Amino acid sequence: KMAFTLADRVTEEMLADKAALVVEVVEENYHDAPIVGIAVVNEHGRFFLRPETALADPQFVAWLGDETKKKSMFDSKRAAVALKWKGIELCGVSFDLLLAAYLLDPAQGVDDVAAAAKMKQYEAVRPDEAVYGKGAKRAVPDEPVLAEHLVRKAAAIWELERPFLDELRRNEQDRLLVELEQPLSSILAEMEFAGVKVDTKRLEQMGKELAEQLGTVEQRIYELAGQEFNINSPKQLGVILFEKLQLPVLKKTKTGYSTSADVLEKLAPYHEIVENILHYRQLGKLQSTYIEGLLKVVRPDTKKVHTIFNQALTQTGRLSSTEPNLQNIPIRLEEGRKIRQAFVPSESDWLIFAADYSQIELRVLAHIAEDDNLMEAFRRDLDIHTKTAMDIFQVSEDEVTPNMRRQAKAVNFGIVYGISDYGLAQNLNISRKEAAEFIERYFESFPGVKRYMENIVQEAKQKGYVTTLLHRRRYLPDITSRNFNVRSFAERMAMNTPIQGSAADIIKKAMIDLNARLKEERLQAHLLLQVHDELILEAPKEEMERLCRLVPEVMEQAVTLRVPLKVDYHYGSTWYDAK
DNA sequence: GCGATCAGC
DNA sequence: CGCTGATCGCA
Incomplete structure (x- = not known):
């Protein structure tokens, strides 16, 4: 329907100093993923560009990298990271519709242009899932369908910018967008692209020890149960505990029985098997989630993991981390904590440096x-x-x-x-x-x-x-x-x-101030992770003494409260040793 | 396709 | 009792 130039070459009217830009990555995990299409809407009209064409053009490349050429986008971070894997710098993003929508109303779960458009009853754009399918049926469609979708997304961004900015301004959220979330987006882009080096042979050795302690634990559970069963089935476990061995039920559930760790520790005294099931649950969790699951997402060339930080999901303003989740690496129990020995500096003679707000x-x-x-x-x-x-x-x-x-x-x-x-x-x-x-x-x-x-x-x-x-x-x-x-x-x-x-606001402001300070000081130190109230960096050995003074000071001075902000810090050869 | 479970803050 | 994500079992 919608009118636009399906261009086969880049023209200077596509390189105007304000535009809505869509750099489309359809793969859910954007790390080293294909860019399938480009849309530009600006004062001169609407443009679709094939990526092989657009990203080979030196003038289009330079327009992307020119901070003075302002772009309005949805999920800039997705575009920035896919471009980083191609050695292309994206600059001059002055408005991100995903972050704008997130700040106005986190409860909408806005994760596409269509859902952001609906907050202002703009309906002339399709949902991504209608165009692409989802998960299993996640395919790029034919060029006519793809190109109209990208151009309609760019046109929606073009029209939606000023009403989102007026509502943000009424809410006193204009600075939260421009001075916190959007600069943080860039910083998250760098962290995700850099990734975290994993010692895959450390994880494989831990894997082999856990497979043997799991084997030892399964057959004593089978011995004490008088029967073989699937211990990982909350349903078959509940029959074994509450029907065959007649253990008491403290917490009654509508369906079957609870086997939560809460209920099992009250049941520990009535039977030997209980504690063994809890040891089995703790090891099977290290084995399936942190050994097997980590190894599945390590890049086999660099042996790095590249998390994706969702900046626009939590109802409180926190980040979330996926594929893998690097914000729930075990630490509380000693045998889980050893997993952190596998997270190592990406270079010779670098160290891991962790700083955490106390309370x-x-x-x-x-x-x-x-x-x-x-x-x-x-x-x-x-x-x-x-x-x-x-x-x-x-x-x-x-x-x-x-x-x-x-x-x-x-x-x-x-x-x-x-x-x-x-x-x-x-x-x-x-x-x-x-x-x-x-x-x-x-x-x-x-x-x-x-x-x-x-x-x-x-x-x-x-x-x-x-x-x-x-x-x-x-x-x-x-x-x-x-x-x-x-x-x-x-x-x-x-x-x-x-x-x-x-x-969350305070640690996001600390990350921004930290990066400005690291640049002023021309330190090689860089952020790898945020875990809600802690920052984890890697740096050359030679930088440790200066970072013990700089990182705590930046984090302590991020905001002024009526009480001090206190920060502890540690460093070491591995994430485990940074304790 | 979702509840139960458990890892983190 | 707050906020998350991953794996598994079973439908």
Whole structure:
């Protein structure tokens, strides 16, 4: 339908200093993937270009790389990375419709031009899944169909820029787009392209040890069970535990029985088999997800993994990481933690450097609640769980037992997640009355936190949304629901989203400031990963002493709060040793 | 095609 | 009780 020049050569009217640009990568994983088509819409009209044509043309290449030639795009990062794998630099992206839509309303799950277009009732563009299929049926169509789709996406971006920018400006989110998320997009592009080197023989050796401890564990489970069965089947396990061996059921489920780790540790004392199933679950998880699954996505040439950071998915402003997920690499239990020995510097005589905010959520809570007891605790750099135990249990420091600190720590998680008696009682394996007593004691010791939690729910009902430090927004329409379970979950989101979201805003601003400082200092050090409240870098050995001073300082000074931001850091030959 | 489970923050 | 993603089993 839509009119445009299906051009076979590049012309200077395609290289105007403002344009909507689509550099289409249809492969879901864009790492070293083909670019199937190019669309440009600018003051002169609408243009489709074959990529072999466009990317061979020196003038088109230079227009891509010229920061002065402004481009409006959807998912710039996708385009930037696919171009990086071809040695082509993309610059001058001044508007990204994906990030604009994400900031206006994260709840829409906008992941294509069509869904962003719908927020302004622009319907003259198809959804990607209607054009390409999905997953199994993910094929590039014939040139006429492809070209009309790309040109209609570019035209949608062209028309949608100014209404998205006017709404962002009304929301006071204009700076969140221009000065935080879009510069971060570039930084994520570099991190993903660089990747993380994996020691694949370390992982294969761990794989072989786990296959033997799994074998040893399966047949003692079979011995104790008096029968062979699929241990990885929650259904067949539940029959073995609750029907054949007649173990008690503490947590009744509508369907069958729960075999969650929560239920199995209460069942450990009644039967030997239980602990063995939990050891088996821990090893089978290392084996399937972190050994086998990691090895499947290592590039066999470089032995690097190239995560994709989804910048536009989480309801709080956090990143997510896929294929592989480099934000859930084991660390808590020692045998899982060894996996991190396989994550190594990409060059001879480089080291891994990890810096992590200490208790950023509770420090952000202290800031926004202006609780004088919590702010003083941080100004004194106290152990916050110990001091919370001292206050809610009414004891001196010396009188806090390890069980008291364990319980106070779970209250502190509770407070930032949005406490409920039923939630804390579940976590602590106590009654609801006992948990409500802890919560009451917490609020008598931190009355500013109690005020804040009432005033922010009260503010979420009046406004219909909540905000973070840097004006990220989440809409909480379930705040006015007559169903108790659905309205309490909205009240929890109103308590938690400003905390978790403020913490995301701060680490995103740190990453931007860190990269400016690394460039000013012309250090070879670079970001590999973000894990929510930690940055992981690799650098030459020679740079370690300067980064021990520079990275913490940049992360501490990212934002000014009423309490200090505290950062710990470590470095070593492997991610494991950076502890 | 989704629930259960478990890894991270 | 907050936020995620991957694997597996079973439909």
